[PDB]
Write a protein that binds this ligand. Structure first.
Ligand SMILES: [As]
Ligand SMILES: [As]
Ligand SMILES: [Zn+2]
Ligand SMILES: [Zn+2]
Lengths: 171, 171
């Protein structure tokens, strides 16, 4: 199974230093789907204030983060988040015109729970800003990925997942 | 003289990848003081939206960023900013009780224009959040430093420098 130490090995690939205490604060998400290396996300929250947040994400090789959106909370538009690939490769899919031939697909057994198909390919240095309240999902290439998130305040509990099988306590 | 390529060499020390286009967007600040390697700052802005901002800062060995504060703009408290050392060492001085014996001092010829003395020493992985509208300055150790800034929206032009000799067009 996935461990926090294994996630930290990817931070180290990217040259990103966490203290021992911080490694213990890494979050492992499997979304209750029982297939963590295929569908899951791992992250470390640097900071989350009433105005801004940053996280360092790790995806293992071929791992997919399932489709979700960040809805308005407290009268704003929803979380806007900027994703910057630090290591590896990530295929990000966002609302927009469907890419006719995508480079990767979500897991076949869950595919009906993915609805957006506009492809953004990110290698290290690549960056993209996902607009508030828009559906998105992403999958790492065969070396995995480390991705920085820079955003407005995060409230994971309000995130809305396309797959109805994914519950609030899963985020 | 300092060049953008030289600044990028420090990003590379920290494992941080910028594209060629991004290297060209690095900002070099000397604050009009004519001693860039002693008093100055270099940075790359990843993103700056109406809600959040992130920058990657470089300080050369022994270089000091002069004292300033981020005042309220638009009815909020002022920019709150989280500083995380990625490489090297930085000595950060913030409002608070004066550290009786600091590890470093600002340039002797400008020292009267530094007024806060509460010392925070950061090595890689170290992080500190500078509260809104509070004076702060910082200086790298003998290997220099790379420091990530994560903050609310940045508006450099409204920053207030303690040294009256530093002008608006210098930031
Ligand atoms: As997320
Ligand atoms: As700054
Ligand atoms: Zn998201
Ligand atoms: Zn500042």
């Amino acid at each position: 199974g996935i461990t926090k130490e294994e996630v930290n090995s990817y931070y180290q690939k990217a040259g990103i230093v966490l203290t021992d205490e911080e490694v213990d604060q890494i979050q492992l998400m499997d979304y209750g789907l029982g297939k963590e290396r295929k569908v899951g996300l791992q992250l470390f929250v640097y900071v989350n204030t009433d105005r801004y947040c940053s996280k360092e994400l790790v995806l293992f090789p071929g791992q997919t983060c399932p489709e979700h959106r960040h809805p308005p909370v407290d009268g704003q538009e929803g979380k806007q988040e900027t994703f910057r690939c630090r290591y590896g490769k990530v295929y990000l899919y966002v609302e927009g015109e469907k890419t006719p031939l995508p480079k990767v697909l979500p897991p076949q057994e869950d595919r009906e729970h993915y609805t957006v198909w506009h492809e953004i390919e990110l290698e290290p240095g690549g960056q993209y800003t996902i607009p508030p309240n828009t559906k998105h999902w992403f999958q790492a290439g065969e070396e995995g990925a480390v991705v920085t998130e820079m955003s407005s305040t995060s409230t994971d509990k309000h995130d809305i997942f396309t797959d109805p099988r994914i519950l609030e306590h899963h985020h």
